[PDB]
Design a protein around this ligand. Structure first.
Ligand SMILES: Cc1ccc(S[C@@H]2O[C@H](CO)[C@H](O)[C@H](n3cc(-c4c(F)c(F)c(F)c(F)c4F)nn3)[C@H]2O)cc1
Length: 138
């Protein structure tokens, strides 16, 4: 397995038609997972499965600008399961990141950070065994 937290450079930033694929297995009794598409210290797109937020499972998405988190976007469809292998696909579209988990569409996140070419790393952290993280153009 790859070492978590893992940094995946995104050379030249992201662009529409770029597909990022993350394969891993959720740890037993997981609490949290995060993907962080970063523009320097800013987080353009934070994708954060929470397994126990007041006894509910929820995906929280947000952006961090100058160390401040913005308005959260929440999704109660929750396709992750402790102990189980998953696939996350993040497709960059012109106006949003489009996320599918285990081949099922999950959510879209409209671009708040609009300098897509400056979003040039992806951090992967939290309660997973990370098998692979890669990108390709579709
Ligand atoms: C005013 C206010 C008060 C409380 C909060 S709570 C905050 O909410 C954010 C989304 O709006 C982020 O989720 C943020 N956050 C989570 C992580 C994280 C992770 F999600 C992992 F999965 C992980 F493995 C790890 F190491 C982490 F550090 N880092 N920052 C959270 O602290 C936010 C605003």
């Amino acid at each position: 397995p790859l070492i978590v937290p893992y940094n995946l450079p995104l050379p030249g930033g992201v662009v529409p038609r770029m597909l990022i694929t993350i394969l891993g297995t959720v740890k037993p009794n997981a609490n949290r997972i995060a993907l962080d598409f970063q523009r320097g210290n800013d987080v353009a797109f934070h994708f954060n499965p929470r397994f126990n937020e007041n006894n509910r499972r929820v995906i929280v998405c947000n952006t961090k600008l100058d160390n401040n988190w913005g308005r959260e976007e929440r999704q109660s469809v929750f396709p992750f399961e402790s102990g189980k292998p998953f696939k996350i696909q993040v497709l960059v579209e012109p106006d949003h990141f489009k996320v599918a988990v285990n081949d099922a569409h999950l959510l879209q996140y409209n671009h708040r950070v609009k300098k897509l070419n400056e979003i040039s790393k992806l951090g992967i952290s939290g309660d997973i065994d990370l098998t692979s993280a890669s990108y390709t153009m579709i």
